[PDB]
Symmetry: C4
Subunit: 103 residues, 4 copies
């Protein structure tokens, strides 16, 4: 099992862990802030995933410092995780082309 | 026809299929939810494509569990599909540079 | 001048052309649609760039079929253009590591 | 220390500098525009980071020419910086696969 595939797998599991951890921590950070909407777990998970994919509909978002810090972590984990999948695909293609070239 | 170009082509066709399937399933999942707006097919397709590209204007979004699950599938298919195109471009450039180096 | 750098340069010029063309065509497609906001050129250019980078604040967006089609073109051009820059960076790094390995 | 890792490190520091500089300049550009909301530094930094990651919730955005120009710089720096991290990961994977192939 090549490194890039293992890394891709691990990245996926870690992202899921971050999305989960982020939804809990977001609710923890946001309750107590008048007007906050990221305060129940199910929609917080929806918020986490739509932030990690960087879609950001804006239907939900953090208003506190720690909620936003949590958000940045979720964003970075999502961007780098998917970026890593891209990197693994590149490695796969590069390898196949070398073979196709007799190497 | 190198693998990366075939993969890029296939990824494109699959994405189109997902955007189509996602618009139908989104409407199916969202009707029945008071207040939902992702309920007619044309705008649902607009929603699907703007989600797959991860643009997310927020003019439309799912409010139900299954609509959101459908959304996650659309997001992932879009991100990985475009990511794959990037990976194919990298393979193309890597190959040309090797040649430019006499290999 | 290696291919990837030339491609990166060309991609940048083309993107600028698309952003420009997209702002004109968006206004052309949207005027005539009651309620449309993407109807003056300066903000249309702001809309084009924030769509191409896939940021999508949602302060502006197309409501017509052709405005949305124009949007999809802008999105794709932005994603693939930046993706190509990424691919060129990968080629640059791959080349330097080979050298660092005595190849 | 291979180039790609140094580049990745430098890209990260530069991005942080841009996010910081962007929040100051955004407030500078936006105050004086009736209705503008990107006018206090803490939320401006939140705006900068959520723009650089291209998340774009839409809770905050620039309304002036220079605020939007600043925004474009932030967007580009974010996209290219994360793109570079992706490129570095690809180089790392490519290198490990070559070794795994006895090269
Ligand atoms: C540490 C933080 C952990 C957070 C864990 C969240 C646990 C929530 C229970 C799970 C589902 C509840 C369903 C429900 O009745 O809610 C629906 C109401 O319409 C839709 O809600 C939602 O928006 C849920 C969508 C979740 C999408 C997840 C995509 C993951 C790739
Ligand atoms: C399985 C799910 C399938 C969903 C299929 C959708 C079929 C809809 C018929 C198609 C067009 C109708 C036009 C119309 O009169 O609508 C216009 C009204 O202003 C604009 O609407 C729209 O927003 C359509 C924009 C579609 C963009 C698609 C981009 C694809 C890359
Ligand atoms: C084919 C379509 C072509 C469209 C061309 C657009 C021409 C507009 C003239 C240019 C500037 C006008 C300034 C003004 O007085 O407007 C300011 C008002 O606050 C800010 O406006 C704006 O939002 C302009 C922001 C533009 C950002 C462009 C970023 C490019 C990478
Ligand atoms: C040149 C421009 C420089 C701009 C520098 C900004 C300096 C602000 C001081 C820092 C924190 C203040 C906290 C506070 O009391 O504010 C909180 C109020 O709820 C949350 O605010 C916020 O939204 C801050 C979130 C910042 C996230 C940064 C993520 C970086 C990767
Ligand atoms: K995005
Ligand atoms: K976005
Ligand atoms: K958005
Ligand atoms: K938005
Ligand atoms: K919005
Ligand atoms: K809104």
């Amino acid at each position: 099992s090549a490194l890039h595939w293992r890394a891709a797998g691990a990245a996926t599991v870690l992202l899921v862990i971050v999305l989960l951890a982020g939804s809990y921590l977001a609710v923890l950070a946001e309750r107590g802030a008048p007007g906050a909407q990221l305060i129940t777990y199910p929609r917080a998970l929806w918020w986490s995933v739509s932030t990690a994919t960087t879609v950001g509909y804006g239907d939900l978002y953090p208003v506190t410092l720690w909620g936003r810090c949590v958000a940045v972590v979720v964003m970075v984990a999502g961007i780098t995780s998917f970026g890593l999948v891209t990197a693994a695909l590149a490695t796969w293609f590069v390898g196949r082309e070398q073979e196709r070239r007799g190497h």
